[PDB]
Amino acid sequence: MKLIIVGAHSSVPSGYGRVMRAIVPRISKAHEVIVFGIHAFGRSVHANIEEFDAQTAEHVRGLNEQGFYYSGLSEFIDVHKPDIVMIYNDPIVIGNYLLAMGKCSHRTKIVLYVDLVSKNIRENLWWIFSHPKVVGVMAMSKCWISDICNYGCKVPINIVSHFVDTKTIYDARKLVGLSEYNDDVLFLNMNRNTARKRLDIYVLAAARFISKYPDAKVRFLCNSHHESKFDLHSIALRELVASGVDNVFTHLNKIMINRTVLTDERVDMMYNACDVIVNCSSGEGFGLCSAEGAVLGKPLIISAVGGADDYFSGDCVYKIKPSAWISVDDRDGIGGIEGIIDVDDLVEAFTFFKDEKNRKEYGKRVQDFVKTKPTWDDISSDIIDFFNSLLR
Amino acid sequence: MKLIIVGAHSSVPSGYGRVMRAIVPRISKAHEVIVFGIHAFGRSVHANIEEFDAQTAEHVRGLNEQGFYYSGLSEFIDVHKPDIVMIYNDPIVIGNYLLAMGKCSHRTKIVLYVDLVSKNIRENLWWIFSHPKVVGVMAMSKCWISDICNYGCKVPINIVSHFVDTKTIYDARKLVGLSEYNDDVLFLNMNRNTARKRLDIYVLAAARFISKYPDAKVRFLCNSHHESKFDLHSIALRELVASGVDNVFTHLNKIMINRTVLTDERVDMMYNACDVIVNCSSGEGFGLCSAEGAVLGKPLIISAVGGADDYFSGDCVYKIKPSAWISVDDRDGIGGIEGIIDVDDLVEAFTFFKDEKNRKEYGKRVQDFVKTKPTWDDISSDIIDFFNSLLR
């Protein structure tokens, strides 16, 4: 069959780009796959699969549609005449694409691969799941099935997860320049400083943990950008002053903030270098920035939300359930409700993993647990298999 | 003595205005009080106390300082030569006034009456509590004392609460336009629709309550202005679908969103008409938007936060403890951390008060308990005692 995938270009250093680079050449040996590649950062990565770079095509035409090239898609399909069109993005972007192909000549079967991050998304986006042209829906986790059904989807739903690989680098603490801290247990939260990721909770919990154990040899690493809404040091500072602990400033410096941009091998280095991986976010589609270190046999503390909660557990990981729920309609055009963990539960989790006997045991469990997870091959073959049931 | 109060003009229909209208003429019979009244909406309300209208004076000068008239204060003090200047506002505004009076010639003793709503306010605001001209600090509730101390205040701190009088009004439900709902028990949240007030949670708990008691003669009233960030019917709709309950739209209609504006008679009427008063906010300075119902002997559901927790005993009211904490630095220049209740604790609170016997018992208890709260006379008298003690 002939398959058009509307998604991230191979040059894109993002979550979407990463799954595109994995899935595209794997489906290519079963079918003809042609990529409408969006948001290109540079050169295409495949020698022999047809990848259209939609962003520079949009610049050539003098349009600015943020690299989505909504105006080009209808003609692209009309020419190629695919058996299937898979659209892989969030619900807003998917909506835009379905409108753009409303005056499309070729009758094509549409498969959605939706990135969902919150329960109860806006009702005005629900129509995409029951659009006449849509013939199957693909979700990234089991938990999203019942939402998608609640949104009124009546076509087959298939779960398409991801596979995680991180390069295992020896002597990593030295190589990232963290050799002062050879004695310290390093907690690492690799998430960006945005509202969903709740770095405020992370650093509040760090501050509380430190005020309760002011001599523990411990560091809390995290990321921040210029003029993020949360100033992480300032948050922690105020929590240390309120606890009454002495030497506020020295405890404060136990939270280490990286402000520089990622290079993909500093990121891998960080995971190898640290002792505990932490994600306390509000919502997770797949539950990416964490499972990354499970292959390395690092203990994990995770908020049991969305996919993260499905991905893990016969108790290989330290799971914290949301203690309260809020609307997140104010963040985003997509919105929903999301679950917020109790700062004190994260403190308890940090104190569980200050014991190296627990780090060892849990590191071992998740390493073994993730050996079982299906690889890009198993996943991509699942994809094509789901595609074959939808044509004949 | 000669006292200048920098606060809300008498014409202002806000919380600040309401306390200014109470305290000014009460202190006026002990001392000479002169008001630098800010943000005027209209005519001054006192016949014989000197009330300067700062906003219109600012317009006359062609300035726009949002009605605070920061540029007029220093000269106003230099002329009047008061014994004390009381600045009554939040910490940012207080900071602005202290900077504006930095080239003031008259040496005057400053008393702060700070409105605090959150713990852990930004460290760059803390200087106001130990500023060289500040000689006392007044706070609205006991819980704020230890914060104010932590921010490094070394001068006397006095607690100056508020008195609530709502009139009692016979056949209120008929008189406010609620006569179609005679069978129902009416839950009322009178708070404005802002992030701190958490109407997302109120409406999410209403939706959930309804899903599991489809048949309860119940209604959840609340307010909403032109465009806030929370669309409450939309948030409620989504939750209703998620629950799986039939007849979604007739159930949506038990959440009644008032958009019409409040005459003060009608606000008071709302309180008399309803059966249960609800406040699920994240932070509360004094404990305002509920105290109102108490004098009427209405049962109350309140989140146990800030001043609201100091004001009510656990035995006369239904208190829900925060289940999680987040930073609120993103809302605001003040910031801090605030405590969020769990939606399901509110559902349990609703079900408690669907029992008419519980409403009767708890209505009677709040009414009895609040009988002995300080009066505007006691409060104002205690304000003058504090000032006297600071003057020698």
TrEMBL record, chains A, B:
Q: Which domain of life is it from?
A: Viruses
Q: Name one Pfam family in it.
A: Glyco_trans_1_4
User: Which SUPFAM superfamilies does its entry note?
Assistant: UDP-Glycosyltransferase/glycogen phosphorylase
Q: What is this protein called?
A: Uncharacterized protein B736L
**Source organism of the structure:** Paramecium bursaria Chlorella virus NY2A (PBCV-NY2A)
What gene does this protein come from?
A: B736L
